[PDB]
């Protein structure tokens, strides 16, 4: 299996009400392992997975100082972008930032990310060659010329191709009992009359990890798109995931339809029929 | 592990 580490940062201004709200979360794959909340009591990077708690105080002290510096830089960013867009000093605005790395099944570097959004719009993004930038409008072009002149991409690449994958591999080993696990979907099919001549078949996948999954409907062996619906994969809240797919079928024809679930935890794709 | 190096927009 391939793997990823992602850090997500949200900074939301609140003029007159103190410094911006800053929330940072860190993920390996679909497992959250750290968070920071500028408004929480601890004022520390906090563990969110069992395998990260084995890191000593040096690790937590250092991540706390870094994440607090992150918050202060993104607080300056809110001020800067306000000027770029000639926006009023009064309103609330949102800076989002994401960075991280993917590795392949050999745990060697696959790709890296470093990108920003302002008020939900793309702002600036490191391109896949990790050497160039996509600026979404004319304020972001200002950032891009500055970052080109400061050779920012070169320093990001040192992290994305190096440090980021080295620590990702550390977490994959230290957390192997949960990060390298696959929980196979528990599956079942429900059925509901929907009109006087139609019924909804719902194919359920429960309790699976990781979140990647494929649920398909077939009629007489042929994949079916007409009258089907996919719900967004959702968290159960215990570290596994849930998802369903439904199709509306003529009543009396339930048995020509099959649901098909593929998931890394399944040695062979499952086939369910009403 | 967080990236330490920070650059302002």
């Amino acid at each position: 299996g391939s793997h990823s580490m992602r850090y997500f940062f949200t900074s939301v201004s609140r003029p007159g009400r103190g410094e911006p709200r800053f929330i940072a979360v860190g993920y390996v794959d679909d497992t959250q392992f750290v968070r920071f909340d500028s408004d929480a009591a601890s004022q520390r990077m906090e563990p969110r997975a069992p395998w990260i708690e084995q890191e000593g105080p040096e690790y937590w002290d250092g991540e706390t100082r870094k994440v607090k510096a992150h918050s202060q830089t993104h607080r300056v960013d809110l001020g800067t972008l306000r000027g770029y867009y000639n926006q009023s000093e009064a309103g609330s605005h949102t800076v989002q930032r994401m960075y991280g790395c993917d590795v392949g099944s050999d745990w060697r570097f696959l790709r890296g990310y470093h990108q920003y959004a302002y008020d939900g719009k793309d702002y600036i993004a490191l391109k896949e060659d990790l050497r160039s930038w996509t600026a979404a409008d004319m304020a972001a072009q200002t950032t891009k010329h500055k970052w080109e002149a400061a050779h920012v991409a070169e320093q990001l690449r040192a992290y994305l191709e190096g440090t980021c994958v080295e620590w990702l591999r550390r977490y994959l080993e230290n957390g192997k009992e949960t990060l390298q696990r696959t929980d196979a979907p528990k599956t079942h099919m429900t059925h509901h009359a929907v009109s006087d001549h139609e019924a909804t078949l719902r194919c359920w996948a429960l309790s699976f990890y990781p979140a990647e999954i494929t649920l398909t409907w077939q009629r007489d062996g042929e994949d079916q798109t007409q009258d089907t619906e996919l719900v967004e994969t959702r968290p159960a809240g215990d570290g596994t995931f849930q998802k369903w797919a439904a199709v509306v079928v003529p009543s009396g024809q339930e048995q020509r339809y099959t649901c098909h679930v593929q998931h890394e935890g399944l040695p062979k794709p499952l086939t369910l029929r009403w | 592990l967080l990236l330490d190096r920070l650059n302002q927009l």
Partner: T-cell receptor, first 107, second 113 residues
Framework: EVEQDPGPFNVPEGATVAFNCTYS??????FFWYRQDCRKEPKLLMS???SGNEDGRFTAHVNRASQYISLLIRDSKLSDSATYLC??????????FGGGTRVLVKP | SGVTQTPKHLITATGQRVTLRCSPR?????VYWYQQSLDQGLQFLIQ???????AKGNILERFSAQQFPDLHSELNLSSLELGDSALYFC????????????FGPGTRLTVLE
């Protein structure tokens, strides 16, 4: 957290000299070499953010596994005689300086 | 202009006070004070950004600093001791959180009995 070899390294003119500096915190990921002439201010020589960096007759290399930083100076000139400071960045905002390595290039 | 500092040299007696002045690089909003001594090398004292104290090293109570609206900085040392003899370096950077710190030429302070 930054320990380097004080020297003085006596280098025949035109020879190659290299010295190490070690860092304690494995999470550290940004380092630099600075040059400082006697009683003057420290000046950036070269940054090292990844496994290594080569800038001209100078070559620096971060052994992230070994947790040490190296500098190498090829074809040493008398003008290279100086103190070389091993420098670690922390948290994105703080520089920590080693005590310095003195090199004396002999004519 | 680059980073400038005044005076270049100060000779004073124990118990006195002095003021060190720094004008950062034009365009720089951060100013940092560093102390270089024979016994502990180069040590970070304090950083201002746009007039506000922002990061603190192991600066003593009897040391105090300031960045003014024109972004120049003043480092005041009081109840001077022999041990305060050192090279005091101003540095500046464009941004709040930066490793790209450009050092001034230093003020040398000697405190004699």
């Amino acid at each position: 957290e930054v320990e380097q070899d004080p020297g003085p390294f006596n280098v025949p003119e035109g020879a190659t000299v290299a010295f190490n500096c070690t860092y304690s915190n494995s999470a550290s990921q940004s380092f630099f070499w600075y040059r400082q002439d006697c009683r003057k201010e420290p000046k950036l020589l070269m940054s090292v953010y990844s496994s290594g960096n080569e800038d001209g007759r100078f070559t620096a290399h971060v052994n992230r596994a070994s947790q040490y930083i190296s500098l190498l100076i090829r074809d040493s000139k008398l003008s290279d005689s100086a103190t070389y400071l091993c420098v670690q960045g922390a948290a994105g905002n703080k520089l920590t300086f080693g005590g310095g390595t003195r090199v004396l290039v002999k004519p | 202009s680059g980073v400038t500092q005044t005076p270049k040299h100060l000779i004073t007696a124990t118990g006195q006070r002095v003021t060190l002045r720094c004008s950062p690089r034009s365009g720089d909003l951060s100013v940092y004070w560093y102390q270089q001594s024979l016994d502990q090398g180069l040590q970070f004292l304090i950083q201002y950004y746009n007039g506000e104290e922002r990061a603190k090293g192991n600066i003593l109570e009897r040391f105090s600093a300031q960045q003014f609206p024109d972004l120049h900085s003043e480092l005041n040392l009081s109840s001077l001791e022999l041990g305060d003899s050192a090279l005091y370096f101003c540095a500046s950077s464009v941004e709040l959180n930066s490793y790209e710190q450009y050092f001034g030429p230093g003020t040398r302070l000697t405190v004699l009995e």
